[PDB]
């Protein structure tokens, strides 16, 4: 694979502009009765002649407003296939452990169209589990024409962006590497990883930037990447990362590859 840093930055940090002013962010699913509340709207744009929706704020949303509960099929933990994205699933915990997933795909409820945050600056929603269900809570004042984008809130034990557990008010098990919202988790891991590097050092952050791009381009194998990254950053990754990358890296590559050329 021979991708440029700019086309990587596009998939991790970019957005498509519409005929208007507001832009759609990229959780560009579909790689090859809404009951929508007041103040919100569903917004289609086109990407590769493939329809792509997003939930936008038509008016105003104050910080601390909570929407939900998320609605969808109940997927038992065993029947979720591997090498798949599962763009619209949430992990449901009971008593400290993974119970089941809740699949919003094809629900037709408006919340299943809210895309994920790939990094915090574009994030205005927090995913929050209460009782058995998922809610989205605004973490910022949401202004008109700004897109609603969610990520796993605190109350989820996370490592560099990826959630491992339901943060305790004690239990001990990680969700298996094959699960919900995998491509979004991968993006969130890579961006968080990049920011993590920059905070240590400019030279170290630049090393990671090239090291990640080389990984995305399969120039370097994951275990090769893992070692060199730990060498360059002087910081140990959790064991889940290698199988996580082996499972989900080919999703970012497939999407990255999926780009139209001008006309």
């Amino acid at each position: 694979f021979n991708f440029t840093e700019e086309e990587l930055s596009f998939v991790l940090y970019g957005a498509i502009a519409s005929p208007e002013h507001p832009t759609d962010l990229q959780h560009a699913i579909s790689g090859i009765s809404l009951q929508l509340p007041e103040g919100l709207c569903l917004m289609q744009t086109s990407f590769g002649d493939v329809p792509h929706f997003g939930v936008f704020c038509s008016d105003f949303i104050a910080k601390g407003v909570r929407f939900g509960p998320f609605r969808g099929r109940v997927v038992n933990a065993s029947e979720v296939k591997a090498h798949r994205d599962n763009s619209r699933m949430w992990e449901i915990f009971e008593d400290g452990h993974l119970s089941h997933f809740i699949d919003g795909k094809g629900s037709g409820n408006w919340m299943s169209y809210v895309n994920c945050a790939r990094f915090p600056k574009e994030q205005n929603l927090l995913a929050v589990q209460h009782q058995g269900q998922i809610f989205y809570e605004s973490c910022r004042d949401i202004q008109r024409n700004q897109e609603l984008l969610v990520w796993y809130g605190n109350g989820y034990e996370k490592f560099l962006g990826v959630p491992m557990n339901l943060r305790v008010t004690s239990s001990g098990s990680l969700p298996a590497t094959c699960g919900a919202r995998q491509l979004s988790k991968l993006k969130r891991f890579l961006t968080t990883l990049q920011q993590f590097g920059n905070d240590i050092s400019p030279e170290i952050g630049e090393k990671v930037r090239t090291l990640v791009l080389a990984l995305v381009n399969s120039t370097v194998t994951i275990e090769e990447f893992h070692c060199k990254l730990q060498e360059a950053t002087n910081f140990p990754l959790r064991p889940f990362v290698i199988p996580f990358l082996k499972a989900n890296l080919p999703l970012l590559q497939r999407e990255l590859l999926h780009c139209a050329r001008a006309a």
Binding site: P37, E38, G39, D59, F60, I61, A62, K63, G64, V65, R66, H130, S138
Partner: protein, 93 residues
Amino acid sequence: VSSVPTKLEVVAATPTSLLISWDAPAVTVDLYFITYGETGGNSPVQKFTVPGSKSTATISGLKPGVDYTITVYAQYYYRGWYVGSPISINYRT
């Protein structure tokens, strides 16, 4: 034009759980947030929701003896989604 609730009252039910009550504000309410956490404590503050239909909730799993700050406030829609200002009380079970 008012959003803040009134007459919030707290009663102990078990040494670790309270029954709280309030009466709705002027505005039409979607959610009430209920919030509890140790007064003057470095402990985090917890919050759940009850629908506008309800004007009572039960808080549970509290430390007996320790006083908590309970807070309720309304989430409404008025030319935008807003969360109002809260009513507060402190109470040791």
